[PDB]
Design a protein around this ligand. Structure first.
Ligand code: SAH
Ligand code: MG
Length: 160
């Protein structure tokens, strides 16, 4: 379709693990990755963090096939799934943890949806990009070799 430009660029695995640690993801959680790419975040959530449910939303068909293929080869089909669609339109209200690696302007556009649909205490973790106008509970630097990454953690209902 015709959604704001957000190309496929994945979060490095070390940053993926740190985003989930920072949000304190556990078995009780329901993790949504908005724009899931190859599915690495929801697969790590299910496989390493034992989450009861992980859902990736993805609009690109080639990416959906890779993600579904990755879910199968990791054996997590029970708990991890993909929703084909525009993340702007898909209901994310069941999420207890939402992960994002998008763009600051796309973060901006998502602000009404996040506030509308997410319950208080929902944690939202963003790789690299700020949610402008919100106050993060934490801002963390993650070193992956000689690369530095910033991770933002917000908590719905304590973000303003
Ligand atoms: N409006 C939209 N709805 C669903 N997916 C989208 C989207 N806009 C971009 N995407 C997808 O979101 C992905 C962003 S790349 C980030 C992938 C993953 N969250 C990670 O951190 O590794 C791309 O695969 C792109 O196809
Ligand atoms: Mg980065």
């Amino acid at each position: 379709s015709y959604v704001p430009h957000v190309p496929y660029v994945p979060t490095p695995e070390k940053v993926v693990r740190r985003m989930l640690e920072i949000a304190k993801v556990s078995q009780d959680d329901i993790v949504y990755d908005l724009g899931c790419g190859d599915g690495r975040i929801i697969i790590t959530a299910a496989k390493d963090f034992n989450v009861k449910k992980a859902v990736g939303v993805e609009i690109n068909d080639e990416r959906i096939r890779e993600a579904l293929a990755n879910i199968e080869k990791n054996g997590v089909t029970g708990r991890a799934s993909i929703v084909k669609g525009n993340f702007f339109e898909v209901d994310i209200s069941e999420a207890t943890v939402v992960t994002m690696f998008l763009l600051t302007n796309v973060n901006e556009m998502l602000k009404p949806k996040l506030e509308k649909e997410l319950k208080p205490g929902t944690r939202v973790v963003s790789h690299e990009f700020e949610i402008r106008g919100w106050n993060p509970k934490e801002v963390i630097k993650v070193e992956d070799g000689n690369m530095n990454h910033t991770v933002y953690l917000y908590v719905i209902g304590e973000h303003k």
